[PDB]
Structure 1
Amino acid sequence: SMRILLSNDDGVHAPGIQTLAKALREFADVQVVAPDRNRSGASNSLTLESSLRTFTFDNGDIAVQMGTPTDCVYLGVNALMRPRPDIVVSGINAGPNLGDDVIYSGTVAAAMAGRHLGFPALAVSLNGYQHYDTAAAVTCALLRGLSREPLRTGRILNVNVPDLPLAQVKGIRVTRCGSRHPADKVIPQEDPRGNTLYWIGPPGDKYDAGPDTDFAAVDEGYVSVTPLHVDLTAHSAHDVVSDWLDSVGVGTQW
């Protein structure tokens, strides 16, 4: 009955999106529009300079060739899926999307692209690689919840599932995004001709990971549910910025 646009950032060949597709197919109409390769770190990137080609597999799965997760959802909703989906579900990602990492997340971005549909979009990420079935079960519960009663406020739900058997999941926590210290590591590596190439290093250590953060919930064995929005305004900085400008005389003659 429910029309689900299913995407991810790991690609069409990810167990995560496959497991979830099979699970969601049990009770809903599902359509897989996904990248052709691992587009981790793709964030909210989208293809503007080129048009997009859509490669279909035997099972019906639509890849978008060179496509970003945002491209996939954009095409899914406006072009490919008829009738238009009720919800976008993104995942299950192999790996967590927590804290300030969510801005870099293609999984999150796919969900953010579905923010205007009738149901809040779900980004679903597993804190590891083992228990997709656990994350599938959590995803299905939320969808079951959405069918029972619509979520009035909150247009995106960032969901992170501990890499545990479902029996060991302690429950669900409504959380806020934590944050890390700045990532400072670059990993240099020479090419055969001696030229120095650079790899982006690991993330910074956790900084803001308290009582109520997505980090802490997951570390404790709870599902973290964070409502997300696309408004990047640091609203609490408004007055400080205004007073600063006046104090330094920028934008005023006096």
Structure 2
Amino acid sequence: MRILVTNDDGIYSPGLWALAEAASQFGEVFVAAPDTTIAHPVRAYPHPSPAPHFPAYRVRGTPADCVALGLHLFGPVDLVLSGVNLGSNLGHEIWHSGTVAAAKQGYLFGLSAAAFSVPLNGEVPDFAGLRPWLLRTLETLLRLERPFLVNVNLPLRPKGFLWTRQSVRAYEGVVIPGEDPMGRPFYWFAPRPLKEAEEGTDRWAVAQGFVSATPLRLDLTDETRLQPTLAHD
């Protein structure tokens, strides 16, 4: 099988190259990464892979742009992988994730897809010690009914793997006033969750030391509110 690897941090992110080297254990691997709805032009320049040579392209566009060009230039492609993003993509963060959107674009194009992320701020992800678990994870996804759309968060030092649901929490909008060093006022926006992540959620799983894998949906409709509204006698 053939795999397209992209991300949203750039063609130089070591997480991009760690994902591609790991994807290569299961198939032909091709890379298309970002430079940084309507028909637009996209410039794509061949990029030499800094490991087993991977045909790569540097795209002047969005990650979704990469997936589309990556399928054109490298088709056929059976799977679309996005990451590994330097930074988590858990709970409410899934919504806005660029990494996730890349995988979602692949699913919308009919392929199977998965986003991979690791937490930042402090220690940098050690990709050598993460290779085993990256591999294990890929081996599992590859045993799912296709196509699939999955969101993966790997902790810094994984001890396991778990299928998770998204953490969904309420917050109290904390606004704390303050003044900068030179006198100018401002507001410190810092929302705190009203409770701890329940077990079974992606956030929990990563805090316990497990690779979290969440199957995503494309439909945002709240049918439990819609259906009753649409009913008649």
TM-score bracket relative to the smaller structure = 0.7 to 0.9
Counterpart amino acid of residue 51 in structure 1: P
Q: 1:116 to 1:125 in 2, by over 3 A?
A: same
Tell me what 1:70 maps to: 64
Mark the runs of 5 or more structure 1 residues left unpaired by the alignment: 38-45, 191-195, 247-254
**Deviates further, 213-222 or 49-58:** 49-58
Distance 1:29 1:23 in 2: 11
Map 1:1-254; keep pairs closer than 5 Å.
2-37=1-36, 48=38, 50-59=40-49, 60-65=55-60, 67-77=61-71, 79-82=72-75, 84-115=76-107, 120-128=112-120, 129-147=124-142, 149=143, 151-152=144-145, 155-164=148-157, 169-180=158-169, 181=171, 205=193, 207=195, 209-239=197-227, 241-242=229-230
Tell me what 1:250 maps to: none
Distance 1:114 1:178 in 2: 24
Deviations 1:82-109 (A, max 9, x none): 3x11100111110111001101001111
Counterpart amino acid of residue 4 in structure 2: L
Q: 1:35 to 1:171 in 2, by over 3 A?
A: same
Distance 1:98 1:91 in 2: 14
Q: 1:142 to 1:188 in 2, by over 3 A?
A: same
Q: 1:58 to 1:178 in 2, by over 3 A?
A: same
Q: 1:214 to 1:146 in 2, by over 3 A?
A: closer
SS of the residue corresponding to residue 210 of structure 1 reads coil
Distance 1:75 1:109 in 2: 15
SS of the residue corresponding to residue 162 of structure 1 reads coil
Deviations 1:2-51 (A, max 9, x none): 211001111111110012222333442111111111xxxxxxxx6x3631
**Deviates further, 231-240 or 97-106:** 231-240
Question: What's the TM-score, normalizing by structure 1?
Answer: 0.73
RMSD: 3.3
Q: 1:232 to 1:208 in 2, by over 3 A?
A: farther
Q: 1:146 to 1:223 in 2, by over 3 A?
A: closer
SS of the residue corresponding to residue 141 of structure 1 reads helix
Distance 2:139 2:30 in 1: 18
Q: 1:87 to 1:153 in 2, by over 3 A?
A: closer
Tell me what 2:52 maps to: none
SS of the residue corresponding to residue 131 of structure 1 reads coil
Tell me what 1:43 maps to: none
Deviation at 1:157, TM superposition (A): 1.0
Q: 1:103 to 1:134 in 2, by over 3 A?
A: farther
Contact 1:93 1:107 in 2 (8 A): yes
Question: What's the TM-score, normalizing by structure 2?
Answer: 0.79
- How many residue pairs were aligned? 220
Mark the runs of 5 or more structure 2 residues left unpaired by the alignment: 50-54
